[PDB]
Amino acid sequence: MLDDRARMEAAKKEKVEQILAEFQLQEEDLKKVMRRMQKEMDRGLRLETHEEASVKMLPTYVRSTPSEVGDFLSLDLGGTNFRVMLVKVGVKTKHQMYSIPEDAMTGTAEMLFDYISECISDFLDKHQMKHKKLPLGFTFSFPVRHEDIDKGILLNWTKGFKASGAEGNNVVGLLRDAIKRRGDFEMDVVAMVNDTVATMISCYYEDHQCEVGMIVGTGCNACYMEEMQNVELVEGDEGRMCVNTEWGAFGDSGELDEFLLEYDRLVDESSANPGQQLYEKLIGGKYMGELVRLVLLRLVDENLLFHGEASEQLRTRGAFETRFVSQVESDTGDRKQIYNILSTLGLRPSTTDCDIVRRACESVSTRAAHMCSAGLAGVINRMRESRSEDVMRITVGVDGSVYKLHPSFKERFHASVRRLTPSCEITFIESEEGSGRGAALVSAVACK
Numbered sequence: 001m002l003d004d005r006a007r008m009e010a011a012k013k014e015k016v017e018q019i020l021a022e023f024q025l026q027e028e029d030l031k032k033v034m035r036r037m038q039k040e041m042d043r044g045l046r047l048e049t050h051e052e053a054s055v056k057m058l059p060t061y062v063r064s065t066p067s068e069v070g071d072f073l074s075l076d077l078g079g080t081n082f083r084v085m086l087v088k089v090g091v092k093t094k095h096q097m098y099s100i101p102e103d104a105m106t107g108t109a110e111m112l113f114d115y116i117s118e119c120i121s122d123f124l125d126k127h128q129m130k131h132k133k134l135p136l137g138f139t140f141s142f143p144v145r146h147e148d149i150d151k152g153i154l155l156n157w158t159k160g161f162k163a164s165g166a167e168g169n170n171v172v173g174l175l176r177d178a179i180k181r182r183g184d185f186e187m188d189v190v191a192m193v194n195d196t197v198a199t200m201i202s203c204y205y206e207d208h209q210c211e212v213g214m215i216v217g218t219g220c221n222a223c224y225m226e227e228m229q230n231v232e233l234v235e236g237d238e239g240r241m242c243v244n245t246e247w248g249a250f251g252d253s254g255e256l257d258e259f260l261l262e263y264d265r266l267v268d269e270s271s272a273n274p275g276q277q278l279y280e281k282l283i284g285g286k287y288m289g290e291l292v293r294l295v296l297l298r299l300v301d302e303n304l305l306f307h308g309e310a311s312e313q314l315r316t317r318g319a320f321e322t323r324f325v326s327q328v329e330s331d332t333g334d335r336k337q338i339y340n341i342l343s344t345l346g347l348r349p350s351t352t353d354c355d356i357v358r359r360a361c362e363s364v365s366t367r368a369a370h371m372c373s374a375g376l377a378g379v380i381n382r383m384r385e386s387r388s389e390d391v392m393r394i395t396v397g398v399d400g401s402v403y404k405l406h407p408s409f410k411e412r413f414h415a416s417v418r419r420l421t422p423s424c425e426i427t428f429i430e431s432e433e434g435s436g437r438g439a440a441l442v443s444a445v446a447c448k
C-alpha cells in the first residue's frame, strides 16, 4: 500500500542521511584544520624546519620588483592533457592541446619528454615556425625545488604521474635533453612555473591586487606573494616572492588523521601515491568522483541503493567521473540529469535512487569546498598578519575544472573562506585566458 512504501522510503532516507552525516565538518573543525595548516606553512618557510615540514612552501623566483616584447612559447603539463601556446607580448594567443598516452604518464621520463618534444614539433609545423627559436615558459604542475626561475628539481610526481628517472632531476634539463635528442627544433627555455603561479600572473595582468593563485582542478594547490624576509630559503629581504605552498601534501605527516573517513583511506590505498597528497585527495577532481563512487558502493552494500546490486561500470575504478558530480548537482529537480549519468553507468535507477546519488554528491563536494576553504583562509590570514594590515583587500586568481564547472563548489567555498578570514575583503577572479598567458608574461621578464 501507499503507507508501506512511504514508511520504507522514510526509513531508507534516514539511514542514508546517517551515513552521509560522517562528511560533516563544523566551523570549529575547519578552524582546527586552518590553524594546523598555518603552523605547517610557517614551518615550510623556515630554514630550520623546511626539511621536516609537510607543506613545503617552495620559492618560485617570481618576484614583485621587476619587460621584453615578441613571440613566446608556453607549455603546460600536469592539469588535463599537454598544452602548447604561442603568445605575443607587445597579449595575443594561438593554441593546441595534446592527449597524453597512458604509457607516457607511467613509463620513463625519456618517454614523457620525447612525447612533449613530439607535440612541440607538431605545433610548430601547424604554424610554419619550426625554424624559429623562441623563449619558452614551462608550466609544470608538480612540486619543484628551484635554484632559479629556469632551474629546478622535481621533488616527487603527483596526480598519478609515475615516470621513472625524473624525481631528483632538473625538469628544465629533462626538457632540454628531449629537445636535443629529437633535434627537430630549438627553443630557449627561460622560465618554469607552477600552474598556481601561471594563474596568479595571468590574473594579476587583469587586476594588480591579485597576489594569490589557486587551482581546484585535477589537483589542489595555491601560491601567494610572501615577504622576502619570510622566505628564508632565498637570500634577501626586499620586496615579495611568490611561494608555492604545495598544500596538497598537508596531512602526509598525520596532521589530518582524525578527519579521514574509510572512503579517504580506500582512495589513498588504491592511488598511485599511497600516503601522499592526503589534503588534495579530499578536494581534487582526480579523487572527488572516486570518493562519490565508494560512498555509492557503501549505500549499495547497505541495500539503500539500486536494490543492493551494483553494475560492472559502477564497480569499475574511476568510472564515476568528477564531471558527473558536477552534472548531478546541476539537476533542476526533475532528476533527468542524474538519470542519464546512472543509465550510462549501466544502472536502472528509481526516482529515490537519483535523489540519494545527489545527496552523496553534495556530501563529498561540500566537504571538499569546506576543507579547501580552511587552506585558503590560512594563506589569507597569514598574509594579513605578515603585512600588518588592519583590513586587507586582496584578489585571488583561480583556475581548475572543479572550481569553474561545479554548480555549487564556488558558492560554498567563497562563503566559508570569508567566514574564516576576519577583516579581509576578498575578490575572486577566474583565469579565463589559460596558464599560457601567465607563463609567457613570466618568460618576458625572465628572458632578460
Ligand SMILES: CC(=O)N1CCC(c2nsc(Nc3ncc(Sc4ccccn4)cc3Oc3cccnc3C)n2)CC1
Pocket (backbone or CB within 6 Å): 061, 062, 063, 064, 065, 066, 149, 201, 204, 205, 225, 441, 442, 443, 445, 446, 448
Ligand atoms: C632578474 C631575474 O632573472 N629574475 C628571475 C625572474 C623574476 C621574475 N620573472 S617574472 C617576475 N614577476 C612578474 N612577471 C610578470 C608579471 S605580469 C605584469 C603585468 C603588468 C605589469 C607588470 N607585470 C608580474 C610579475 O610580478 C609582479 C610584479 C609587480 C607586482 N606583483 C607581481 C606579482 N619575476 C625576476 C628576477
Ligand SMILES: OC[C@H]1O[C@H](O)[C@H](O)[C@@H](O)[C@@H]1O
Pocket (backbone or CB within 6 Å): 078, 079, 140, 141, 142, 143, 158, 159, 194, 195, 196, 215, 217, 218, 219, 220, 221, 222, 246, 248, 280
Ligand atoms: O595542478 C594543481 C596542483 O596539483 C598537485 O597538487 C601538484 O603537486 C601541484 O604542483 C599543482 O599546483
